[PDB]
Amino acid sequence: CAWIPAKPLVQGATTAQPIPGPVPVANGSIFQSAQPI
Amino acid sequence: CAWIPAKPLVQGATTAQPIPGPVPVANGSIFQSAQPINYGYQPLFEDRRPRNIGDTLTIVLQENVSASKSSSANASRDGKTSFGFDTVPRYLQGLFGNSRADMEASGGNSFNGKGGANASNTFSGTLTVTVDQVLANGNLHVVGEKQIAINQGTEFIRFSGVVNPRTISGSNSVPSTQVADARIEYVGNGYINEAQNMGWLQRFFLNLSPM
Amino acid sequence: TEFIRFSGVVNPRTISGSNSVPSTQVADARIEYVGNGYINEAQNMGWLQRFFLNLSPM
Amino acid sequence: TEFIRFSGVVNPRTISGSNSVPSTQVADARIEYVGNGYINEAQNMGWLQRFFLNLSPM
Amino acid sequence: CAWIPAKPLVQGATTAQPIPGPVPVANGSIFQSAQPI
Amino acid sequence: TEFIRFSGVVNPRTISGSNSVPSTQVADARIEYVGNGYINEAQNMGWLQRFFLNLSPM
Amino acid sequence: LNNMLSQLGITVPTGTNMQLKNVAAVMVTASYPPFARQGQTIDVVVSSMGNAKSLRGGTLL
Ligand SMILES: *C(=O)CCCCCCC
Ligand SMILES: *C(=O)CCCCCCC
Ligand SMILES: *C(=O)CCCCCCC
């Protein structure tokens, strides 16, 4: 049937939320690098 | 029915109201900057590749697979033997007379088997996905979904996979053949989709019929 | 739903400049192209015909 | 499912510059190309016909 | 039948997870080489 | 299954530069090209016809 | 050169025209000294390897 609930091939949430970057440390620098892996 | 209230695909308010800017501080300056959300360091000459969770990336779906196979076999055999003493001389009548040695036999055999199979699939389109995780070696896990509703039903195109950043082109796009764990899905609903499922009786027969 | 699965062993000096290898250079190649749904069910032989294909005298 | 199996003995000075050897230069060549499934079952002779092919007088 | 469970030709998991590299030793060097076979 | 067997004696000064000899330069050449399976069984004469081919008067 | 550019963050499309004049491909050779310790320095020899005219004022990457 077409009314029986089936799960989709691509499961879970299909979107992501950007996260705010860290607060810049108050040295004399403009270049701020978030923790780099 | 057409009078039963259904919710639209695009829900909520479809408009926004501009907000008045802040009152300018009375320093000696004309340049007034509203509170700017500081984003991190951004390179200048490097291409716009996705780097963090939430960045977007265009996938160019171009799939084309085609496999096939076949085989056969055959065998045959014929045979036909005969012997007939038409006029037997007298001194041989004691051995080949009265057709006591005539003979005639035939035989045949045949066989032919064969078989084959094939499969194919194509896919063409474009879809923008979003990064939802950055792996330990720099690869990006991407997911995406596009929903369309043209006048009667609703179609869903979903995509999921893993991308290597050094494959993204200069225009922030990747062909779908370079994604590792590609999961593509193109489905729909409405009665147009319901008209393409087999009836439960025919589905039962297709599996349990003897032939 | 169609599934294309692949497994094998690759020698690094055969990978091209665009990070690609033709499948004829993989050692223990296992390729699989299968599917499900009623489109796939319409291509299996019926159990009676399958029985006859094996146990029929000719 | 189709299986292609190969076994043999190779002399290193016959391997080309692209790491390839034609199969006519392998000594104890054993090549095999078989399959299974009902497509392969449809190519074996029936047991009765197989019996007749061997024991029929002609 | 088509409902009888059969195992696929390619068995096991068809994906792998990258492992984080080792922590770099604090000599005066930028070049850090993970244990090379 | 098909079998190609070969046996013989070779004189080294006849081997070409590519390590190859034409079979007409081998002394005690024994060549054999046989097979098995029902394809080969379909090419033997029936025992009755084989008997008649030898003992029939004409 | 395309490999290096891609590593740095710039992906040049494939099958495009590219004709340089200020770049040469070279082989670098050196002698690993006895009891060498990490951080020390040695001297290298640089040699052209295809149809280059001169390495007069070049820099080794
Ligand atoms: C969808 O609702 C189809 C379900 C019918 C299956 C049983 C019919 C008697
Ligand atoms: C729209 O109003 C259609 C609803 C009719 C459904 C029931 C008919 C007996
Ligand atoms: C798939 O479910 C087919 C199984 C039927 C085999 C036995 C039929 C009596």
UniProtKB/Swiss-Prot annotation, chain B:
A lipid is attached at C1 (S-diacylglycerol cysteine). Pfam families: FlgH (PF02107). It is a lipid-anchor. GO terms for biological process: bacterial-type flagellum-dependent cell motility. GO terms for cellular component: bacterial-type flagellum basal body, distal rod, L ring; cell outer membrane. It is found in: Cell outer membrane; Bacterial flagellum basal body. It comes from the Bacteria. PROSITE patterns: PROKAR_LIPOPROTEIN. GO terms for molecular function: cytoskeletal motor activity. A lipid is attached at C1 (N-palmitoyl cysteine). Keywords: Bacterial flagellum, Cell outer membrane, Lipoprotein, Membrane, Palmitate, Signal. Belongs to the FlgH family. Assembles around the rod to form the L-ring and probably protects the motor/basal body from shearing forces during rotation. The basal body constitutes a major portion of the flagellar organelle and consists of four rings (L,P,S, and M) mounted on a central rod. This is Flagellar L-ring protein. It comes from Salmonella typhimurium (strain LT2 / SGSC1412 / ATCC 700720).
Curated annotation (Swiss-Prot), chain G:
It is found in: Periplasm; Bacterial flagellum basal body. Transmembrane segments: none annotated. The basal body constitutes a major portion of the flagellar organelle and consists of four rings (L,P,S, and M) mounted on a central rod. Belongs to the FlgI family. Assembles around the rod to form the L-ring and probably protects the motor/basal body from shearing forces during rotation. This is Flagellar P-ring protein. The gene is flgI. The chain holds residues 62 to 122 of 365 of the full protein.
